[PDB]
Design a protein around this ligand. Structure first.
Ligand SMILES: *[C@@H]1O[C@H](CO)[C@@H](O)[C@H](O)[C@H]1NC(C)=O
Ligand SMILES: *[C@@H]1O[C@H](CO)[C@@H](O)[C@H](O)[C@H]1NC(C)=O
Ligand SMILES: *[C@@H]1O[C@H](CO)[C@@H](O)[C@H](O)[C@H]1NC(C)=O
Ligand SMILES: *[C@@H]1O[C@H](CO)[C@@H](O)[C@H](O)[C@H]1NC(C)=O
Ligand SMILES: *[C@@H]1O[C@H](CO)[C@@H](O)[C@H](O)[C@H]1NC(C)=O
Ligand SMILES: *[C@@H]1O[C@H](CO)[C@@H](O)[C@H](O)[C@H]1NC(C)=O
Ligand SMILES: *[C@@H]1O[C@H](CO)[C@@H](O)[C@H](O)[C@H]1NC(C)=O
Ligand SMILES: *[C@@H]1O[C@H](CO)[C@@H](O)[C@H](O)[C@H]1NC(C)=O
Ligand SMILES: *[C@@H]1O[C@H](CO)[C@@H](O)[C@H](O)[C@H]1NC(C)=O
Ligand SMILES: *C(=O)c1ccc(NC(=N)N)cc1
Lengths: 261, 235
C-alpha cells in the first residue's frame, strides 16, 4: 500500500514490495515507469510467481488520468514483455487477503519504438502482425497476414445517406476509386455486400456519373473470385447505388409464442 | 434475474453459457460466427489461458448438455477492452474468440449490433437473460431465466447511485420498486431491446449495488459506444 513510486533510467530495477518469498496481503502498489518525451517502455519480467486470478498485476499505459490497459498477468509462469506507447507506464499489484505467493521482479528500459518492428522499405505493405506483403495479399483473396489486416478495408461506402448505403468505391492497391455498372448483376452485388460485412444486395440503382477517379469495371468468373480490371475507359458511365441488408440479426427463428407472463 | 420466469427453448439463441473448469461464471452474447461479448470483470485475470473457457452455444437447461442442439466450443483469444478500469467499473466489456466456426440454426443465432448514435429513450422496456441467481443469498437457476426491465436516464441513475460514478458508457435499467433485476451469475450477458422486429444489444451487465432491492437499478455497459471496437474484430 506504501511501496515505491516513479522510477527512471538510472535505476530501472524494482521488486514488488517483499521479494523474499512472501508479499503482504491486501497490497496495492503503483510503479509509475517514466521515460523521455518520445520513448516508450519495455517491461520484462525476470521472475513472476503469483497466486491465481485473485492476485493479478495490472500494467497500464496511462500518461494521464484515463489509463489504458496493456496486460493482466497472474499465476506462476513466464510472462511476455509489455511494450508501452507513451512515455509513462503504470503497474498495479492487486492482491487478496489470504494465500500470499512469492512475488515478481522486472526491469524496464527506455527505447525508440520498442516492440513494433521497423517497417520494411521498397513498397512493402506492413499489416498489423508486423510482416511485409507488397502486393501478394493487398485485398486479393489470400490469408498471408494472420491478423487479417491484409484483407482489411479496401471497399467502403462513398457519400452514403444511411449506414448500410452508399457507393461501391474499391481500392486496387492505394487509390480509392469507385466502380462502374458495365455487367452489374445481383450475384456480384450480394458478393460485394458480403465482402463489406453486411447481408445480401438489394435495389441496385445506377444514377449518373460524377466521380473522375479511375473507376473499375466489376465482372464475374466461374472460379469464384471477383476479377476487377481497373481500366479507365467507358462511355455513359453509371455509379451503382449499393444498398445491402443486415446480416442474421436478432430474429428469433425458433418455435416461440407470445404470452404476457 | 430474480423476479422473472423461465424462457422457452430457443427464445434466446444468442445467450452463450461460459464455463471455467466445469462451472458457469458469466454468460456471453453471440455476435459473430466465432466472436462473443462478455463482461470484462469475470475474464479479468483469466485471459492468459483461453483454453479454460468453454462456450456452450444454444444452451437451454444447465443439466441437459447432451442435447442435439448444444454446440460446445473452446476459446482461443480473450480481448479485454483497453479502457477498462476495475476500480471505476468503466468500459466493462470484452470479446472472446471461439476455437472453430459454428453453423447458424434455429436455436443458435448471432445477436444484433446497435448502430452509431442510437438514442434509447428512458422508460423503454428491455429484456434480459442468463442463468443467474433468483435470489441474492441463494442458489442459481437451472432453467434459462428471463426478465424485462425498463431503461433509466443517466441523470436519474446517478441520483439513485451516489456510491458509484455513472459515466457516459453506462446505461442503467431497473424498476422503481425493484423485484425484477439481474443478479450474480448474470454478468457478461445481454440487455436486449426489440426494435423493428430485431433484438439489438443495448447493454452488457456490468455491476450494481445489490440485486432484488427496491430503487436500486442495475448498471449495464453501453454497447452503443463500443460498436466500432467490436466491429474492428469481426472483419
Ligand atoms: C535511483 O535510485 C536512487 C536511490 O534511491 C535515487 O537516489 C535516485 O534519485 C534514483 N534515480 C532517479 C533518476 O531518480
Ligand atoms: C532486464 O535485465 C536483463 C538482465 O540484466 C536483461 O537481459 C533484459 O534485457 C532487461 N530488460 C529489458 C527490458 O531490457
Ligand atoms: C457527396 O457529393 C457531393 C456532390 O455535390 C459533394 O459535394 C460532397 O462532398 C460528397 N460527399 C462525400 C462524403 O463524398
Ligand atoms: C459486359 O462485358 C462485355 C465484355 O466482357 C462487354 O462487351 C459489354 O459491353 C459489358 N456490358 C453489358 C453486356 O451490358
Ligand atoms: C430487400 O428487397 C426485398 C425485395 O424487393 C424486399 O422485400 C425487402 O424489404 C428489402 N429489404 C429492405 C431492408 O428493405
Ligand atoms: C434435452 O432437451 C431436448 C430438447 O428439449 C430433449 O429432447 C431431451 O430429452 C433433453 N434431455 C434429457 C436428458 O431429457
Ligand atoms: C456446417 O456446415 C458445413 C457445410 O454445410 C458442414 O461441412 C459442417 O459440418 C457444419 N458444421 C460445422 C460445425 O461446421
Ligand atoms: C414494461 O412492462 C411492464 C410490465 O409488463 C409494464 O407495466 C410497463 O407498462 C411496460 N412499459 C412500457 C413503456 O410499456
Ligand atoms: C464522476 O466522475 C466525473 C469525472 O470527471 C466527475 O466530474 C464527477 O464529479 C464524479 N461524480 C461523483 C459523484 O463522483
Ligand atoms: C453480475 O453478475 C451482476 C450484475 C448486476 C448485479 N446487481 C444488480 N443488477 N443489482 C449483480 C451481479
Amino acid at each position: 500500500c506504501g511501496g515505491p513510486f516513479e522510477l527512471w533510467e538510472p535505476n530501472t530495477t524494482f521488486s514488488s514490495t517483499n521479494f523474499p518469498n512472501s508479499y503482504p496481503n491486501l497490497a496495492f502498489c503503483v510503479w509509475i515507469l517514466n521515460a523521455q518525451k518520445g520513448k516508450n517502455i519495455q517491461l520484462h519480467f525476470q521472475e513472476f510467481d503469483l497466486e491465481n486470478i485473485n492476485d493479478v498485476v495490472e500494467i497500464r499505459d496511462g500518461e494521464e488520468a484515463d489509463s489504458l490497459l496493456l496486460a493482466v498477468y497472474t499465476g506462476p509462469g513466464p510472462v511476455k514483455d509489455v511494450f508501452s506507447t507513451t512515455n509513462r507506464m503504470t503497474v498495479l499489484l492487486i492482491t487478496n487477503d489470504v494465500l500470499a505467493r512469492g512475488g515478481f521482479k522486472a526491469n524496464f528500459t527506455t527505447g525508440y519504438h520498442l516492440g513494433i518492428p521497423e517497417p520494411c522499405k521498397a513498397d512493402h505493405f506492413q499489416c498489423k502482425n508486423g510482416e511485409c506483403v507488397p502486393l501478394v495479399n493487398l485485398c486479393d483473396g489470400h490469408l498471408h497476414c494472420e491478423d487479417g489486416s491484409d484483407e482489411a478495408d479496401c471497399v467502403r461506402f462513398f457519400n452514403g445517406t444511411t449506414n448500410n448505403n452508399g457507393l461501391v468505391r474499391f481500392r486496387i492497391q492505394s487509390i480509392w476509386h469507385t466502380a462502374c455498372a458495365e455487367n452489374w448483376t445481383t450475384q456480384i452485388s450480394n458478393d460485394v455486400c458480403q465482402l463489406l460485412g453486411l447481408g445480401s444486395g438489394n435495389s441496385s440503382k445506377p444514377i449518373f456519373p460524377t466521380d473522375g477517379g479511375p473507376f473499375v469495371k466489376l465482372n464475374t468468373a466461374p472460379d469464384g473470385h471477383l476479377i476487377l480490371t481497373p481500366s479507365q475507359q467507358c462511355l455513359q458511365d453509371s455509379l451503382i447505388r449499393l444498398q445491402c441488408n443486415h446480416k442474421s440479426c436478432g430474429k428469433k427463428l425458433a418455435a416461440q409464442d407470445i404470452t404476457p407472463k | 434475474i430474480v423476479g422473472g420466469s423461465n424462457a422457452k427453448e430457443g427464445a434466446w439463441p444468442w445467450v452463450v453459457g461460459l464455463y471455467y473448469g466445469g462451472r458457469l461464471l458469466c454468460g456471453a452474447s453471440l455476435v459473430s460466427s466465432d466472436w462473443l461479448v462478455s463482461a470484462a470483470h469475470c475474464v479479468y485475470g483469466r485471459n492468459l489461458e483461453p483454453s479454460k473457457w468453454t462456450a456452450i452455444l444454444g444452451l437451454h437447461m444447465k443439466s441437459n448438455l447432451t442435447s442435439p442442439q448444444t454446440v460446445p466450443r473452446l476459446i482461443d483469444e480473450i480481448v479485454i477492452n483497453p479502457h477498462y478500469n476495475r476500480r471505476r467499473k468503466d468500459n466493462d466489456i470484452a470479446m472472446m474468440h471461439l476455437e472453430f466456426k459454428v453453423n447458424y440454426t434455429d436455436y443458435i443465432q448471432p445477436i444484433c449490433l446497435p448502430e452509431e448514435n442510437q438514442v434509447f429513450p428512458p422508460g423503454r422496456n428491455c429484456s434480459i437473460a442468463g442463468w443467474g441467481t433468483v435470489v441474492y443469498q441463494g442458489t442459481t437457476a437451472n432453467i434459462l431465466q428471463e426478465a424485462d426491465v425498463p431503461l433509466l436516464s443517466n441523470e436519474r441513475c446517478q441520483q439513485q447511485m451516489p456510491e458509484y460514478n455513472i459515466t457516459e458508457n453506462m446505461i442503467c435499467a431497473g424498476y422503481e420498486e425493484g423485484g425484477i433485476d439481474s443478479c450474480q451469475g448474470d454478468s457478461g450477458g445481454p440487455l436486449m431491446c426489440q426494435e423493428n422486429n430485431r433484438w439489438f444489444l443495448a447493454g452488457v451487465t456490468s455491476f450494481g449495488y445489490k440485486c432484488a432491492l427496491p430503487n436500486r437499478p442495475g448498471v449495464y455497459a453501453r454497447v452503443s459506444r463500443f460498436t466500432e471496437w467490436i466491429q474492428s474484430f469481426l472483419h
